[PDB]
């Protein structure tokens with residue numbers, strides 16, 4: 001952290017880009033470089049019991065050096081408020097980019113491939129993301145895809161063994177749910193009360209992708225969504241999955257999807 005410097009001098013705080021984990025988040029300008037940053041501001045008086053989780057995510061983010069994990073720039077204490085500075089990703093979240101209409105399987109495969117590259121990095125570093133979902137996948141204005149909002153060490157994306165109380169294979173399950181979310185717009189059971197979903201996920205057979213989607217994509221989903229974690233493939237293996245190989249294209253193509261969300 002940094003208790004000496006004054007973040008309100010070092011950064012110009014602009015519009016809020018939504019609420020987030022434990023505080024409000026703002027677009028802002030690093031006044032020395034004029035690069036755009038995301039600023040999360042947490043009132044530490046208003047969040048006693050959550051502070052340890054806050055630090056835990058600070059530690060994990062600071063240990064990540066990858067093109068597929070949102071860059072962390074540091075944190076500052078000003079009076080009661082903790083400022084946390086990350087890079088700003090101007091394309092928005094994958095969830096946002098679902099609004100104008102359905103994604104095609106090229107777009108789905110491209111986003112899934114970049115997520116897999118992030119999970120391969122994290123898992124190779126003996127880390128677990130713990131909250132893979134479309135709302136936690138951020139795109140740069142050039143279409144690069146990055147992971148954010150790590151979960152702490154809502155049920156729809158949770159693996160059954162997480163609910164019952166796991167390793168990196170829990171991220172593979174969440175990726176399967178996220179694949180359904182990117183194809184269909186929402187995860188399985190999204191109409192139901194969360195406490196019903198809490199017993200549905202361990203009780204029921206795994207969700208399947210339903211609709212007129214290609215068979216490789218349905219098999220990609222099925223491969224992720226096996227109740228037995230050891231039967232789930234690794235992220236390295238899924239990077240070679242035929243759905244990915246036959247459908248993913250350059251990430252720069254995803255700028256069309258970002259422009260669409262701007263015209264909507």
Ligand SMILES: CNc1ncc2cc(-c3ccc(-c4nc(C)ccc4F)cc3Cl)c(=O)n(C[C@H]3OC[C@H](N)CO3)c2n1
Pocket residue numbers: 017018019020021022025038039040053054055057058061070072084085086087088089090091092093135136137138148149
């Ligand atoms: C739209 N472009 C965009 N670019 C970047 C960000 C970065 C964050 C973010 C994330 C986490 C933390 C953080 N937190 C803790 C508790 C500890 C350490 C930490 F570093 C800090 C920040 Cl600055 C951010 O909220 N957002 C908005 C966010 O998106 C994902 C959605 N699920 C919610 O809204 C962003 N948005």
